[PDB]
Symmetry: C6
Subunit: 255 residues, 6 copies
């Protein structure tokens, strides 16, 4: 039993968390292997906002959003937490999908609770068992009470809960690839072509396309979403202009 | 060791407040419950200042300002606090209307105070049965003595107070519509068209009209509330110039 | 016995202060009591300085300055301190008048001291009584001894002192009729018309007086305190011009 | 002894200090009295530094410099410290002068020592005496050793000391008629006529002698210490221009 | 006995570290010894980030990158750490290679382990020798347990490990010509020559080439990786132009 | 009893150091002492860095670098610290020389040792004497072991060590008549005349040169180290021209 020296290690999560937020397509590769703390795991709002941002921008056929969520759900999390996390990231419509899916995942645990009355999450006698009510939060002291849910549930059940949740999440997050951010990028008459080009180029830098498909998309935005007379100015540009840079030059020539 | 580890749980409350106070247009879906704490709950002044900003600017004409009071009035706190918040936010005349509404509201408690003694804000024995004077703060140890009210009142009496007050607020925050900030928006030689326009766009954003009413209202403050040669300049502008953007472009074109 | 659980409740004191400095026009109305505390108050430097800044800047000709000085004399404090505060705010000359006025004010307390001895600023038997030299800090161990004055005075006497002071203050702050800091605003070659004007607009922000007197006064002062060739330029200006902004426009046209 | 009350009743220290460092000619008028603390008084640099800044600039041709020293030398000070303080501010040549002057002062203490032994800076019995070598810092254990001086001295002797020091200072703060830093001021091609004019306005701001003498001096510092071609410009200027402002405007007229 | 006096004497490690981070080109010669402290060391993320910065920028065969790597591998660490670190700095492919090399090293310790079954890191009972599973973190209780690896492996073995690791790094850090970043310095129309040239000059400062080979390589880069039209401008350029500065001047001449 | 009340006394040292490092040519004059403290001082990194910066820039051309070194070697320190200080500031060539010089100094202790076997560093018998190996830190336990040196050396020995060290340095810091970094600053096309002047003003401010040798050198620096085409522009400048300011004006005339 506690307390154990020193603490602490290296920390790789601290390192990890750094490298990622420190040149992210350079990729944080150090393992992060966390044990202890309470039965359940505390939370950080910062991780949530930066996840909200990603959920805004990329969404969630991105494997950044997916990567950052995955990592966050290595946690033994309470039902109230899962509820909030899910309702927050998914918002009304997809949360329903998830809620349902997740309900199947619980249903599949009542199968394994029945197959194994004594698996990790499970108890050793008839009441002590992991039951529908536990799992749905309908047990007495769970419902309306996250501390009670925390006082009643075991870490094994919390992990089972978080996998079920992650599962139901993977099952739901495969819908609606068609991009996205770019579509709300229109040149302001307030804005310079270059400020726009840069805002857009930033979004394109942030796209997941093959570089070779980037430039046709960029040129389409230039052609379609700059300023009409400038679009027309582009119409007079040759086809011998073949990259946005050449086009940028053509505009720079006239100012 | 003991009691209640860590203290305590995690971190929805914090995350809510965080997330709210972060890019507000669409924010903060996690459920937050906060048991227990002292019998009553000392205030957050910053949240209250910015509420005053909202209450100033938009007021209660947003259900964001209203939404934010609601949230702030989940708190159990004392008649002195109710008083000090309401006098300050309402200002004299509407504070008076509220006062009257709040007494009415309190009158409905004197029915539920007689009818029932089982309720959280009432006692069983005659001396435990709650009196008017306590509920009106006109009880001994209450008048000129919040520490005394704090010392006399039960939690159930706070929620009751809070409920009569919120009701009496809901009952008063029906009154008034006509927008609003706009009425002070007019262009001097003190600011440029660009400056005025921005100030206006920011306001525009803050108006609650559907987008369909926004251009005609913008256009109207422009023609009459721009600088006099510039209103005239707008009178020379083609009718064909239809969105604000085009009209802005027409000003952009000539200096 | 003792002391004071938690401490504490709302704040309403700091909240009051806060609000005032948070949109000055109409803000800051909660009730503030401050319950119990040093009854032998050891003030705060910042609160005096910003008052100093108002006394310097505006002066004391303000029912807001007077108000904030009142508010600062809500405290139970020592005569010595009352003296230093008054010496700094009043400035030497009025301070002297005050000092006399305060002695008269104090003289009328020797009436209520002789009439009654029950009151908080007094004691029952002959020595128990609060003597004049004591009330004036003029008794032994008080002379050249504010701590000794603190050890010899009891709380009620301090409130009395404060009331006498506070009255004596009010009897002196009837003040001038000329206004104001404005009189030394004059355009040098050190500053543009715009800067000068803006400096004048700041001063106009500082004119609380009838909105209706401001533009004739401004046109006159602008005419007279502007740079001479500008004065003459204003001497060429149209009579039809009715506001400074029009007048600014006229200058704005020529350079 | 105690328990203490609390420590402790306050401020006018910070209030005093604050006001002075918040506009020096907007005189600080409270009163601060002091006791206690160890035998004597330790110091922090901010006042020493800001004094050095004064000592450089006006020095001790300001009766505010003399004043800020007078006040710092209200303190019960240990001789080594004093010695050093004087060694810093005076500089070797006047430091010497002081040294000699102080030594006389020290002689005058042997007078009050020979006359009497009843003083705070002396013992009553002959063994109790505050001898010459001791008075000189040069008694056994005082030699080279301010902690030993501190272990052998008495507070009454720190006062005695501080007076001896302070006196010898005052006789010597007789100093220079000439002024002042101003004399090195001459326009470089590094700086503009305006930069020179604002810098000369700092020199003027630091020239506190009659205003009526300031403008002739100012204009002279223009005539002889402006850049040469600008001098030549000033020669073309008419004697009709009678202020620096009028002259500044003539310059401003030309580019 | 223990723990440490005072704690403690200080600190050429800090001084070393300071100096390095203080105008890096030629600094940092104090000897730095530091035992005691932990049994084995939990690193500090900062050193890793800056190394990651160097690994990015320079890469890893530099005489300074190697120097900071040696230093980071100057004290015992877990296999787990070593793993994560090597995997991050080398990247998967070179890390894999690294493992291979490291394995050869690990084999070579099983020789020194067979040769001396009673070596200081080795066993002093019987089968509690330095085995492949220990060295691999796969001994019982080290299996998926970095804490268990830290609790079962002896410091002598960690040092042994650290040398093998370092060897395998030396053994691997024998590859890679590329220079490198440089290949991505081009001039888009997004940058001026002056920004580009500066970016390039920084990259050339960071070159290892003799200065005398630096200018032909910049001159070629200037000719080849400027904006095309800027290259045509360079194309007109005298053969007598013979430095980048002369080239810079040449462009400077034309706009 | 003991051990150190209050803390503390005046300061005189930190203040001293401040004043110096705040007004450098207007040098700080308090006497500074600091008994007691550690047995021997284990360095301060900021203070070593700022000496390092002086050692970079001026080094021992300023009797400031020495001054700061003297102050820093004004208390007893370890052979390892001394060694580390010397190898870092002298760097390899002058360090070797100093080792040698220091070795001479160590020889002179074996004389003073022979003459008095029981002088301050020594102790009763031979082993309490300070043998050569002790003096070299090569006595059993000191040997590559600065903790061992701290465990084995007395203060009396360190102060002989420190003196000897400082002595051999004073002896060594003679070499170099040439002045100063300046010889490596020339104009590029990368930065203009104003920036060259800035560098030049810096070199001038950094000259120790009599003021009278600064104009020949400065003008020489202009004729010889400015941009060539500018040196040529300068070749046309009148021979009457005497200061940089007239040259600056000549360039300005052509700007």
């Amino acid at each position: 039993a506690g307390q154990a020296p020193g603490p602490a290690l290296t920390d790789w999560a601290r390192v990890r968390e750094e490298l990622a937020s420190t040149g992210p397509p350079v990729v944080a590769m150090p393992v992060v292997i966390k044990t202890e703390g309470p039965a359940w795991t505390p939370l950080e709002p910062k991780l949530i906002t930066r996840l909200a941002d990603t959920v805004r921008t990329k969404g969630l056929r991105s494997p950044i959003t997916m990567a950052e969520v995955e990592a966050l759900m290595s946690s033994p999390l309470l039902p109230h937490d899962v509820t909030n996390l899910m309702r927050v990231i998914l918002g009304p419509a997809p949360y329903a999908l998830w809620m349902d899916a997740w309900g199947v995942q619980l249903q599949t645990v009542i199968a394994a609770a029945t197959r194994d009355p004594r698996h990790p999450a499970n108890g050793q006698g008839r009441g002590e068992r992991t039951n529908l009510n536990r799992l749905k939060g309908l047990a007495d002291g769970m419902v309306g009470n996250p501390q009670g849910q925390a006082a009643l549930l075991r870490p094994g059940e919390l992990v089972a809960i978080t996998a079920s949740a992650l599962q139901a999440f993977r099952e739901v997050a495969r819908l609606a690839e068609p991009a996205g951010p770019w579509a709300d990028i229109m040149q302001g008459p307030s804005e310079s072509f270059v400020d726009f080009a840069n805002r857009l180029i930033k979004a394109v830098e942030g796209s997941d396309l093959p570089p070779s498909a980037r430039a046709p998309v960029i040129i389409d935005c230039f052609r379609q979403k700059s300023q009409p007379d400038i679009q027309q100015l582009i119409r007079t540009a040759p086809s011998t202009l073949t990259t946005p840079g050449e086009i940028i030059k053509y505009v720079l020539d006239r100012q």
